[PDB]
Amino acid sequence: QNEGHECQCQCGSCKNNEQCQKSCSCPTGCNSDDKCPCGN
Ligand SMILES: [Cu+]
Ligand SMILES: [Cu+]
Ligand SMILES: [Cu+]
Ligand SMILES: [Cu+]
Ligand SMILES: [Cu+]
Ligand SMILES: [Cu+]
Ligand SMILES: [Cu+]
Protein backbone atom coordinates (compact mmCIF):
# COMPACT_ATOMS: atom_id res chain seq x y z
CA GLN A 1 0.00 0.00 0.00
CA ASN A 2 3.01 2.32 0.43
CA GLU A 3 5.60 2.61 -2.37
CA GLY A 4 5.87 5.98 -4.16
CA HIS A 5 4.90 9.45 -2.88
CA GLU A 6 6.02 12.73 -4.46
CA CYS A 7 9.60 13.37 -5.55
CA GLN A 8 9.61 17.13 -5.68
CA CYS A 9 13.36 16.54 -5.78
CA GLN A 10 15.16 19.37 -7.51
CA CYS A 11 18.50 17.58 -7.24
CA GLY A 12 20.53 16.84 -10.38
CA SER A 13 19.39 13.24 -10.87
CA CYS A 14 15.77 13.96 -9.96
CA LYS A 15 15.16 16.87 -12.29
CA ASN A 16 16.38 14.87 -15.32
CA ASN A 17 14.69 11.61 -14.27
CA GLU A 18 10.90 12.04 -14.49
CA GLN A 19 10.40 8.28 -14.13
CA CYS A 20 10.84 8.55 -10.36
CA GLN A 21 9.07 11.86 -9.67
CA LYS A 22 6.03 9.81 -8.62
CA SER A 23 7.72 6.88 -6.85
CA CYS A 24 11.13 8.01 -5.58
CA SER A 25 12.54 6.59 -2.31
CA CYS A 26 13.12 9.83 -0.38
CA PRO A 27 11.33 11.25 2.66
CA THR A 28 9.93 14.79 2.87
CA GLY A 29 13.44 16.20 3.23
CA CYS A 30 14.64 15.60 -0.34
CA ASN A 31 14.24 19.20 -1.52
CA SER A 32 17.99 19.84 -1.93
CA ASP A 33 20.90 18.08 -3.69
CA ASP A 34 22.53 16.13 -0.84
CA LYS A 35 22.71 12.51 0.11
CA CYS A 36 19.50 12.21 -1.88
CA PRO A 37 19.06 8.44 -1.94
CA CYS A 38 16.46 8.52 -4.75
CA GLY A 39 15.78 5.53 -7.01
CA ASN A 40 19.13 5.65 -8.85
CU1 LIG B 1 12.20 12.28 -5.30
CU1 LIG C 1 16.93 13.83 -5.63
CU1 LIG D 1 12.81 11.22 -8.37
CU1 LIG E 1 16.02 15.09 -3.67
CU1 LIG F 1 16.23 11.83 -3.20
CU1 LIG G 1 13.68 10.14 -4.46
CU1 LIG H 1 14.37 12.11 -5.83
CB of 17 closer than 8 Å to CB of 39: yes
Tell me: is residue 5 an annotated ligand-binding position: no
Q: How far apart are CA 39 and CA 37, in angstroms?
A: 7
The vertex-4 CA angle with 34 and 1, nearest 5°, equals 140
Structure determined via? NMR
Q: Which domains does the chain have, with CATH numbers?
A: 1-40 (4.10.650.10)
CA distances from 12 to 3, 16, 36 (A): 22, 7, 10
Q: Which ligand has the nearest atom to the CA of 17?
A: 3
C-alpha 24 – ligand 1 centre gap (Å): 4
